[PDB]
Amino acid sequence: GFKQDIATIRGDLRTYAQDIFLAFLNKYPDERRYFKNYVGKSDQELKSMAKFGDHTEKVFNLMMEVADRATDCVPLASDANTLVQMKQHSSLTTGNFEKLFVALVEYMRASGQSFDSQSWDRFGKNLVSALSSAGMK
């Protein structure tokens, strides 16, 4: 279930973080414009870029903390507020986050692995609602 998936992701966070983040950028290539250091870099070039690994790790660690603090895939309003108020997110809208969760759920469905994809899609929906409530356009 969803709690086991957090443990699966955390066990190999760097690899899952890098692989899901790349799946996101490759499915929605316009999103790469927000990451001006990752423009014009192949998957293997980014795996060799220390800041890419550090960024993706820090993003997925926070995502897994928000997921673990959720109850029945409902995130805390305080965690949504953190994601809205972050300086690095100031230009974003809820559609950037729904694209990340669409990509994440499709990655999970395609993997060899027994992810609770329906729960990640619900979590993403609930998080988008919470981001909108915390003032994201």
Give the residue from 87, 85, 86, 94 showing the smallest Cα distance to 131.
94
14 binds ligand HEM (CB under 6 A): no
Measure Cα distances from 120 to 28, 73, 75, 78 in Å.
19, 8, 12, 19
Can you tell me which of 92, 94, 117, 129 binds ligand HEM, judged by CB under 6 A? 92
Of residues 16-75, which lie at the interface with ligand HEM (CB under 6 A)? Answer: 31, 34-35, 54-55, 58-59, 62-63
Torsion of CA 39, 45, 47, 49, to 10 degrees: -70
CB of 34 or CB of 133, closer to ligand HEM: 34
Give me the residues that bind ligand HEM (CB under 6 A), please: 31, 34-35, 54-55, 58-59, 62-63, 83, 88-89, 92, 96-97, 100
